[PDB]
Amino acid sequence: MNLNATILGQAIAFVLFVLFCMKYVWPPLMAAIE
Numbered sequence: 001m002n003l004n005a006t007i008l009g010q011a012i013a014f015v016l017f018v019l020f021c022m023k024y025v026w027p028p029l030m031a032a033i034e
Helices: 004-033
Strands: none
Touching: none
């Protein structure tokens, strides 16, 4: 079942999360710790 778009979109779900951590968490994390 080579449903490309779903595997691609699973990788989107992963990458979007990961970079959202690299951007919407990094600065306030940095401010909190130093």
